Amino acid sequence: NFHPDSEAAINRQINLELYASYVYLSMAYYFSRDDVALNNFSRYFLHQSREETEHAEKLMRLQNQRGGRIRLQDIKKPEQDDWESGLHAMECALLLEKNVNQSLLELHALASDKGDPHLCDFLETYYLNEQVKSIKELGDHVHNLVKMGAPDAGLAEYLFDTHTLG
Amino acid sequence: NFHPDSEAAINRQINLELYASYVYLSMAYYFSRDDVALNNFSRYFLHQSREETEHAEKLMRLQNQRGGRIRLQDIKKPEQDDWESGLHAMECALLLEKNVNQSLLELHALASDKGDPHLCDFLETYYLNEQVKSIKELGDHVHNLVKMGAPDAGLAEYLFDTHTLG
Amino acid sequence: NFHPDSEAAINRQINLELYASYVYLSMAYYFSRDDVALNNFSRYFLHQSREETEHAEKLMRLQNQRGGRIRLQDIKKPEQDDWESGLHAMECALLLEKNVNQSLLELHALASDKGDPHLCDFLETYYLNEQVKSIKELGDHVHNLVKMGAPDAGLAEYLFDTHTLG
Amino acid sequence: NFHPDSEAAINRQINLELYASYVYLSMAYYFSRDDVALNNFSRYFLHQSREETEHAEKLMRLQNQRGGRIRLQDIKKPEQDDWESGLHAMECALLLEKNVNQSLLELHALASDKGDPHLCDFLETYYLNEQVKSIKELGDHVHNLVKMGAPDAGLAEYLFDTHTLG
Amino acid sequence: NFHPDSEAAINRQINLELYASYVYLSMAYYFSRDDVALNNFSRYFLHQSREETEHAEKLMRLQNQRGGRIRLQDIKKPEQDDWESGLHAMECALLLEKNVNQSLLELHALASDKGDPHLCDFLETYYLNEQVKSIKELGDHVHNLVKMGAPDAGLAEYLFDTHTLG
Amino acid sequence: NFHPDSEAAINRQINLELYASYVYLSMAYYFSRDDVALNNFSRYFLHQSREETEHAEKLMRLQNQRGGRIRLQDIKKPEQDDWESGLHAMECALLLEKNVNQSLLELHALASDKGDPHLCDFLETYYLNEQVKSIKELGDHVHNLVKMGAPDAGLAEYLFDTHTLG
Amino acid sequence: NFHPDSEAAINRQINLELYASYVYLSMAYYFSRDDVALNNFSRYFLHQSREETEHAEKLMRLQNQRGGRIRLQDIKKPEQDDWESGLHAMECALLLEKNVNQSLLELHALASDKGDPHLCDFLETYYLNEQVKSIKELGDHVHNLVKMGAPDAGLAEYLFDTHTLG
Ligand SMILES: [Cl-]
Ligand SMILES: [Fe+3]
Ligand SMILES: [Fe+3]
Ligand SMILES: [Fe+3]
Ligand SMILES: [Fe+3]
Ligand SMILES: [Fe+3]
Ligand SMILES: [Fe+3]
Ligand SMILES: [Fe+3]
Ligand SMILES: [Fe+3]
Ligand SMILES: [Fe+3]
Ligand SMILES: [Fe+3]
Ligand SMILES: [Fe+3]
Ligand SMILES: [Fe+3]
Ligand SMILES: [Fe+3]
Ligand SMILES: [Fe+3]
Ligand SMILES: [Fe+3]
Ligand SMILES: [Fe+3]
Ligand SMILES: [Fe+3]
Ligand SMILES: [Fe+3]
Ligand SMILES: [Fe+3]
Ligand SMILES: [Fe+3]
Ligand SMILES: [Fe+3]
Ligand SMILES: [Fe+3]
Ligand SMILES: [Fe+3]
Ligand SMILES: [Fe+3]
Ligand SMILES: [Fe+3]
Ligand SMILES: [Fe+3]
Ligand SMILES: [Fe+3]
Ligand SMILES: [Fe+3]
Ligand SMILES: [Fe+3]
Ligand SMILES: [Fe+3]
Ligand SMILES: [Fe+3]
Ligand SMILES: [Fe+3]
Ligand SMILES: [Fe+3]
Ligand SMILES: [Fe+3]
Ligand SMILES: [Fe+3]
Ligand SMILES: [Fe+3]
Ligand SMILES: [Fe+3]
Ligand SMILES: [Fe+3]
Ligand SMILES: [Fe+3]
Ligand SMILES: [Fe+3]
Ligand SMILES: [Fe+3]
Ligand SMILES: [Fe+3]
Ligand SMILES: [Fe+3]
Ligand SMILES: [Fe+3]
Ligand SMILES: [Fe+3]
Ligand SMILES: [Fe+3]
Ligand SMILES: [Fe+3]
Ligand SMILES: [Fe+3]
Ligand SMILES: [Fe+3]
Ligand SMILES: [Fe+3]
Ligand SMILES: [Fe+3]
Ligand SMILES: [Fe+3]
Ligand SMILES: [Fe+3]
Ligand SMILES: [Fe+3]
Ligand SMILES: [Fe+3]
Ligand SMILES: [Fe+3]
Ligand SMILES: [Fe+3]
Ligand SMILES: [Fe+3]
Ligand SMILES: [Fe+3]
Ligand SMILES: [Fe+3]
Ligand SMILES: [Fe+3]
Ligand SMILES: [Fe+3]
Ligand SMILES: [Fe+3]
Ligand SMILES: [Fe+3]
Ligand SMILES: [Fe+3]
Ligand SMILES: [Fe+3]
Ligand SMILES: [Mg+2]
Ligand SMILES: [Mg+2]
Ligand SMILES: [Mg+2]
Ligand SMILES: [Mg+2]
Ligand SMILES: [Mg+2]
Ligand SMILES: [Mg+2]
Ligand SMILES: [Mg+2]
Ligand SMILES: [Mg+2]
Ligand SMILES: [Mg+2]
Ligand SMILES: [Mg+2]
Ligand SMILES: [Mg+2]
Ligand SMILES: [Mg+2]
Ligand SMILES: [Mg+2]
Ligand SMILES: [Mg+2]
């Protein structure tokens, strides 16, 4: 019951989760630079990185289980290594998650048209709800940092680092 | 005391450890295909994948600590997704490790010429000895699988999977 | 295998670690004055003081072990007793550590020219890596206090004291 | 009651136990080569090596206790460092033990002719029975490896390594 | 109620406790030389060193608490690095403690003339009694080593090291 | 990266560690003779013997791991079996360790010229520092026994046996 | 299989073990006199006394078990009650044990001529090895006390009492 258009799309989502993992890894090591030094932003994005790797592995095991063929692509480097500020990194991550969500919604739509309920359920179960939660969490963080005056107010990112992410 | 030629080389080693991690991830999910089904080969390469990620992160933190600038590159996809057999995967991995070792020896040489003892010690401490051990382990595995008659002898890879890697 | 130029240099590094210990002790008791009252800055520098004493003792035991002769010098008082602010103390400490590091790198260079691998290893093992970490930590602290607006912003040093150093 | 012919013979047995210990050490590190890689053969011979050292020390303490004078000889290197295969090493060891046993039986005979019951009992108690058991064990191993088709059958030594010696 | 003559005297006692700490540190590492090798003399003086540092810190905290200004001086190197023998080191230490005691008695006298009961009590409580005990202990050690025949009797310092200081 | 001059030198160091092990074994059983009877000298040298065997095994495993070929030599008997006295044995051991150290320093030099950092690190990590410590310990023992009047003073070796080595 | 010459000899050995027990009891209470006062010599010989009684009882039970008839003789008082010194007592005991050993070797010889393997084994198992060990231990003690200068050196017996026998 496994369409070849389905196989290809799953392969493309795999690459995207890996890309998101790389973006969050890049952010993690930006925040541990000596001229940024926001250690809980760094920890937060590192855990996100590892969650994206988990998302990619689950798709890889879905491919094996349905008898599809995994086909790996280059993992593109992130758009920046100057993430500029804690607020900016959070906004970029929110955007990333929002765009991964659209790719996930397009994959669900393809599975529905192909009559692949297993794939639909798999997405609904492990991806669509965690993505809504991720977007809401980042949206929360973005809002608090904006209110607090980041990045220009000197105390804001520090205080957010030490309370919310601590 | 941190040379800019040094920064660039460290950045290139970071990419290579990430590439090795991707190669081992690809191998892990090859062995969990329904037409290979060697679950302990798969577990073995998955743990290798995660060790390479650890190697790359240690270099990233060395870069931050010396005040260098991390500069990420695309992570190239592995040379194959048909790893062909347990023996073939092991030989490819041995080759990979051997080539990562040469890159590491060239980086040590560059640090010695620049008079960077910290970097030399860092390599001697966390990379050169683990690489010798990795190469010896893979060399051992390659030899046993060859003796046992892999890949053509039907029992060999199965038995190795269930005893040595189990 | 123990050069007399080597003995003298080790003796001079011993004096420098003791001097650094005295600087950090002076800073510790500056921050516990009634017109400064930053008790976690004070605790932080006190622990640094005790680490420098440990560094000096390790060198003294290296001298005994190689059969060199320990030769103690006066320990010079620190450059100031008005450390002026938490930010200023941190910047002075960063500078101190940076200058101790250069002295350590010059001693490693002398041991390499004399073909004293034991001494090189000893430095690489117990000094060069802890010094890189110390400099990075102080660099982090300096950056956060600057961003937060210290010393002029009234809340900055207090908040840093009570969160990061607490 | 301690004959001088007795002293000399004990000294010669001491050298032989040490030689056997060296043979087994050589075998141990043959099996941990990258082109042999039979880790339980290697462990097995290493434990044998350490038992031979124990046998030599017991004789050395017997010499002290009877008031004889220990007189050490060079320990000759083993006949080969290419032990060729697991079966070959086992056959060589069986031969070694058989020849050590004959030396032990000749020493018992000398003690009987000299009317040295203490020495006879000492041999009967700590050497003659352990030697019979060693020879029987090696004889068992040799037989199983032959039946299984070693060294030419690729699976035989591997399987024996992983079951009997594991 | 804190006199400026009082502040200066406290500052001078601080320097003296630090000097005593340096003397005992020097003695500690004399006794761990390869041509002295009295490891419990070495441990004994090391603990004394650390007690003197504690004495100096208590005075530094008294200065802060009374609102005086700590003013650090160079710490002079000890009079010798050849402490010559266990007996000689003990006699030098006894002399040191005796001279620190006189400085302490002069400081108590100054506080009494200034009508500073807090300072008098502080000295009576933490310094005068520990100094009497230190002098008595060193006096005991000096007497036993003399009776035993040190330094000329070869067994005396060794036996004292291994029993009294062990 | 493994030179053949390097292989040969490692093989020669292996033989030397084994020789040192044999020397210490000989000393151990000298001190348990009925006309010497210094049981803690005997225990002390026995533990040294077993440490030298450990040093030789680590080199043997380094050879396997780098793909070199272990090549064993005869183990020469020690220069004496009359070690004459506790002091004499200690002086001989100090000399032995000093000469093993020079062989180790020459091997490090050869590895540096061949650009073998792994081998350099291996030596710096497991051999050069333990050798400095061994030499210092034996130097300490030699000095105390000399001061105490050994071997001519009847009490000296006995007392050292029962306190320092006990 | 029990010869009557065998019965008589066993009876005579029984008397000798009892005599040795009496000698050691006499020595025990010599050393607890107010003009000797070496309490650990006294304890040491008391334990020896009780071991000799155990040796005599084992022979008595051997006689019953073989159906021989136990025939007790007077137990002769020891040769002296002035054992003169710790060294002298030890030398006398060594002599005693040496002479008991010869009696034991003559009994083994008689059992061999009578073809009594049970009796031979019994002697080899419970007597000949403990006698060799006893003689070696006493020989050790005798040597140390001689070296230390006993009985004329005032410290020697006291120190041996308080360390070796303590
Ligand atoms: Cl099986
Ligand atoms: Fe997770
Ligand atoms: Fe989760
Ligand atoms: Fe999680
Ligand atoms: Fe998880
Ligand atoms: Fe995801
Ligand atoms: Fe999970
Ligand atoms: Fe691609
Ligand atoms: Fe996500
Ligand atoms: Fe939030
Ligand atoms: Fe807070
Ligand atoms: Fe790991
Ligand atoms: Fe690891
Ligand atoms: Fe691991
Ligand atoms: Fe891990
Ligand atoms: Fe790696
Ligand atoms: Fe790890
Ligand atoms: Fe790129
Ligand atoms: Fe690797
Ligand atoms: Fe293997
Ligand atoms: Fe099996
Ligand atoms: Fe520390
Ligand atoms: Fe530390
Ligand atoms: Fe610490
Ligand atoms: Fe500590
Ligand atoms: Fe330091
Ligand atoms: Fe520490
Ligand atoms: Fe000076
Ligand atoms: Fe420092
Ligand atoms: Fe910070
Ligand atoms: Fe054993
Ligand atoms: Fe055993
Ligand atoms: Fe055993
Ligand atoms: Fe054992
Ligand atoms: Fe044996
Ligand atoms: Fe055993
Ligand atoms: Fe020889
Ligand atoms: Fe054997
Ligand atoms: Fe068997
Ligand atoms: Fe204290
Ligand atoms: Fe105290
Ligand atoms: Fe204390
Ligand atoms: Fe304390
Ligand atoms: Fe004091
Ligand atoms: Fe205290
Ligand atoms: Fe000054
Ligand atoms: Fe004092
Ligand atoms: Fe005393
Ligand atoms: Fe060890
Ligand atoms: Fe060790
Ligand atoms: Fe050990
Ligand atoms: Fe050990
Ligand atoms: Fe060694
Ligand atoms: Fe060990
Ligand atoms: Fe040879
Ligand atoms: Fe050694
Ligand atoms: Fe010593
Ligand atoms: Fe008993
Ligand atoms: Fe017993
Ligand atoms: Fe007993
Ligand atoms: Fe008993
Ligand atoms: Fe008896
Ligand atoms: Fe018993
Ligand atoms: Fe009678
Ligand atoms: Fe007896
Ligand atoms: Fe003894
Ligand atoms: Fe004592
Ligand atoms: Mg690109
Ligand atoms: Mg559902
Ligand atoms: Mg549905
Ligand atoms: Mg490509
Ligand atoms: Mg000055
Ligand atoms: Mg190095
Ligand atoms: Mg030969
Ligand atoms: Mg028998
Ligand atoms: Mg001066
Ligand atoms: Mg009062
Ligand atoms: Mg010779
Ligand atoms: Mg190193
Ligand atoms: Mg180096
Ligand atoms: Mg009579």
GROMACS .gro file of N, CA, C and O in nm, chain A residues 13-25 44-60 93 96-98 100-101 104 126-127 130-131 134-135 138, chain B residues 25:
model
  180
   13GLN      N    1   1.113   1.465   0.369
   13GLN     CA    2   1.092   1.508   0.507
   13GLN      C    3   1.210   1.467   0.595
   13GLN      O    4   1.246   1.540   0.687
   14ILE      N    5   1.268   1.350   0.569
   14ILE     CA    6   1.383   1.305   0.648
   14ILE      C    7   1.494   1.409   0.640
   14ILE      O    8   1.554   1.448   0.741
   15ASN      N    9   1.524   1.453   0.517
   15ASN     CA   10   1.627   1.554   0.499
   15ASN      C   11   1.593   1.680   0.576
   15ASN      O   12   1.682   1.742   0.637
   16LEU      N   13   1.466   1.720   0.575
   16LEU     CA   14   1.427   1.844   0.644
   16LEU      C   15   1.443   1.834   0.796
   16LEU      O   16   1.475   1.934   0.863
   17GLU      N   17   1.413   1.718   0.854
   17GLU     CA   18   1.431   1.706   0.999
   17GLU      C   19   1.578   1.714   1.032
   17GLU      O   20   1.617   1.776   1.130
   18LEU      N   21   1.662   1.651   0.949
   18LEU     CA   22   1.805   1.658   0.969
   18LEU      C   23   1.856   1.800   0.955
   18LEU      O   24   1.945   1.843   1.030
   19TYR      N   25   1.804   1.873   0.856
   19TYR     CA   26   1.840   2.014   0.842
   19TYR      C   27   1.802   2.093   0.966
   19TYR      O   28   1.881   2.172   1.017
   20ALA      N   29   1.680   2.074   1.017
   20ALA     CA   30   1.639   2.144   1.138
   20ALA      C   31   1.732   2.108   1.255
   20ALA      O   32   1.766   2.192   1.338
   21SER      N   33   1.770   1.982   1.264
   21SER     CA   34   1.865   1.943   1.368
   21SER      C   35   1.997   2.021   1.355
   21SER      O   36   2.052   2.068   1.456
   22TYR      N   37   2.046   2.040   1.233
   22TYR     CA   38   2.169   2.115   1.210
   22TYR      C   39   2.153   2.262   1.244
   22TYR      O   40   2.243   2.325   1.300
   23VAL      N   41   2.038   2.319   1.213
   23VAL     CA   42   2.012   2.459   1.248
   23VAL      C   43   2.019   2.477   1.398
   23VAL      O   44   2.086   2.569   1.448
   24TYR      N   45   1.949   2.390   1.473
   24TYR     CA   46   1.952   2.399   1.619
   24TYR      C   47   2.092   2.369   1.675
   24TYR      O   48   2.132   2.427   1.775
   25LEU      N   49   2.168   2.281   1.612
   25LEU     CA   50   2.303   2.262   1.662
   25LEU      C   51   2.385   2.389   1.644
   25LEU      O   52   2.461   2.427   1.732
   44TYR      N   53   1.901   2.484   2.560
   44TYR     CA   54   1.768   2.469   2.501
   44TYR      C   55   1.777   2.427   2.354
   44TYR      O   56   1.711   2.331   2.311
   45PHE      N   57   1.860   2.494   2.277
   45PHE     CA   58   1.866   2.460   2.134
   45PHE      C   59   1.935   2.326   2.112
   45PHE      O   60   1.899   2.252   2.021
   46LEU      N   61   2.031   2.292   2.196
   46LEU     CA   62   2.092   2.161   2.184
   46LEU      C   63   1.988   2.051   2.201
   46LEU      O   64   1.988   1.955   2.124
   47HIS      N   65   1.897   2.064   2.301
   47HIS     CA   66   1.795   1.960   2.318
   47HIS      C   67   1.702   1.957   2.198
   47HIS      O   68   1.665   1.849   2.151
   48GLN      N   69   1.668   2.073   2.142
   48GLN     CA   70   1.590   2.076   2.019
   48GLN      C   71   1.662   2.001   1.907
   48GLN      O   72   1.601   1.924   1.832
   49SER      N   73   1.792   2.027   1.890
   49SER     CA   74   1.871   1.956   1.788
   49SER      C   75   1.852   1.806   1.800
   49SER      O   76   1.824   1.737   1.702
   50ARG      N   77   1.860   1.755   1.921
   50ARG     CA   78   1.853   1.610   1.943
   50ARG      C   79   1.713   1.558   1.922
   50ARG      O   80   1.697   1.444   1.878
   51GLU      N   81   1.611   1.640   1.949
   51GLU     CA   82   1.475   1.601   1.914
   51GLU      C   83   1.457   1.594   1.761
   51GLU      O   84   1.388   1.505   1.711
   52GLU      N   85   1.518   1.685   1.685
   52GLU     CA   86   1.501   1.675   1.540
   52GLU      C   87   1.566   1.548   1.486
   52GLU      O   88   1.514   1.486   1.393
   53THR      N   89   1.680   1.509   1.543
   53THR     CA   90   1.744   1.387   1.498
   53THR      C   91   1.652   1.269   1.525
   53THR      O   92   1.638   1.178   1.443
   54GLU      N   93   1.589   1.268   1.643
   54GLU     CA   94   1.489   1.166   1.675
   54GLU      C   95   1.375   1.167   1.573
   54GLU      O   96   1.330   1.061   1.529
   55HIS      N   97   1.327   1.285   1.533
   55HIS     CA   98   1.220   1.289   1.434
   55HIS      C   99   1.266   1.225   1.303
   55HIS      O  100   1.190   1.155   1.236
   56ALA      N  101   1.390   1.251   1.263
   56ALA     CA  102   1.438   1.198   1.136
   56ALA      C  103   1.455   1.047   1.141
   56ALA      O  104   1.418   0.976   1.047
   57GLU      N  105   1.504   0.996   1.253
   57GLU     CA  106   1.519   0.852   1.270
   57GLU      C  107   1.385   0.781   1.268
   57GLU      O  108   1.373   0.674   1.207
   58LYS      N  109   1.281   0.839   1.331
   58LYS     CA  110   1.150   0.773   1.327
   58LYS      C  111   1.103   0.761   1.182
   58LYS      O  112   1.051   0.657   1.141
   59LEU      N  113   1.127   0.864   1.100
   59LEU     CA  114   1.085   0.853   0.960
   59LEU      C  115   1.168   0.748   0.887
   59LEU      O  116   1.119   0.680   0.796
   60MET      N  117   1.294   0.735   0.924
   60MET     CA  118   1.380   0.639   0.856
   60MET      C  119   1.334   0.498   0.886
   60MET      O  120   1.340   0.410   0.800
   93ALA      N  121   1.386   3.011   1.473
   93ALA     CA  122   1.342   2.875   1.503
   93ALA      C  123   1.191   2.862   1.484
   93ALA      O  124   1.141   2.761   1.434
   96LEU      N  125   1.136   2.831   1.131
   96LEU     CA  126   1.172   2.699   1.085
   96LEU      C  127   1.061   2.600   1.117
   96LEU      O  128   1.020   2.521   1.031
   97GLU      N  129   1.013   2.602   1.241
   97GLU     CA  130   0.914   2.502   1.279
   97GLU      C  131   0.787   2.521   1.197
   97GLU      O  132   0.729   2.425   1.147
   98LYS      N  133   0.746   2.646   1.179
   98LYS     CA  134   0.629   2.676   1.097
   98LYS      C  135   0.645   2.619   0.957
   98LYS      O  136   0.552   2.559   0.903
  100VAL      N  137   0.854   2.368   0.866
  100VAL     CA  138   0.852   2.222   0.871
  100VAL      C  139   0.709   2.173   0.884
  100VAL      O  140   0.673   2.070   0.829
  101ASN      N  141   0.626   2.246   0.958
  101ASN     CA  142   0.486   2.206   0.973
  101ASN      C  143   0.413   2.203   0.840
  101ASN      O  144   0.337   2.110   0.810
  104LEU      N  145   0.500   1.905   0.660
  104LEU     CA  146   0.432   1.791   0.718
  104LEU      C  147   0.285   1.788   0.679
  104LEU      O  148   0.227   1.681   0.664
  126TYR      N  149   0.297   1.124   1.579
  126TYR     CA  150   0.431   1.160   1.623
  126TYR      C  151   0.479   1.297   1.579
  126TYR      O  152   0.577   1.345   1.637
  127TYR      N  153   0.415   1.360   1.480
  127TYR     CA  154   0.465   1.485   1.425
  127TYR      C  155   0.369   1.602   1.443
  127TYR      O  156   0.413   1.708   1.488
  130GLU      N  157   0.334   1.732   1.816
  130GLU     CA  158   0.458   1.790   1.867
  130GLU      C  159   0.493   1.918   1.792
  130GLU      O  160   0.552   2.010   1.849
  131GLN      N  161   0.456   1.929   1.666
  131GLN     CA  162   0.492   2.052   1.594
  131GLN      C  163   0.409   2.170   1.643
  131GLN      O  164   0.463   2.280   1.664
  134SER      N  165   0.563   2.274   1.968
  134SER     CA  166   0.689   2.343   1.949
  134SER      C  167   0.665   2.487   1.906
  134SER      O  168   0.724   2.581   1.961
  135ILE      N  169   0.575   2.507   1.810
  135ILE     CA  170   0.546   2.640   1.760
  135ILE      C  171   0.488   2.728   1.869
  135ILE      O  172   0.520   2.847   1.881
  138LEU      N  173   0.781   2.824   2.120
  138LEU     CA  174   0.866   2.927   2.062
  138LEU      C  175   0.792   3.058   2.050
  138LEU      O  176   0.849   3.166   2.071
  191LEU      N  177   2.512   0.662   1.026
  191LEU     CA  178   2.367   0.658   1.036
  191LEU      C  179   2.307   0.586   0.916
  191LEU      O  180   2.215   0.506   0.930
   0.00000   0.00000   0.00000
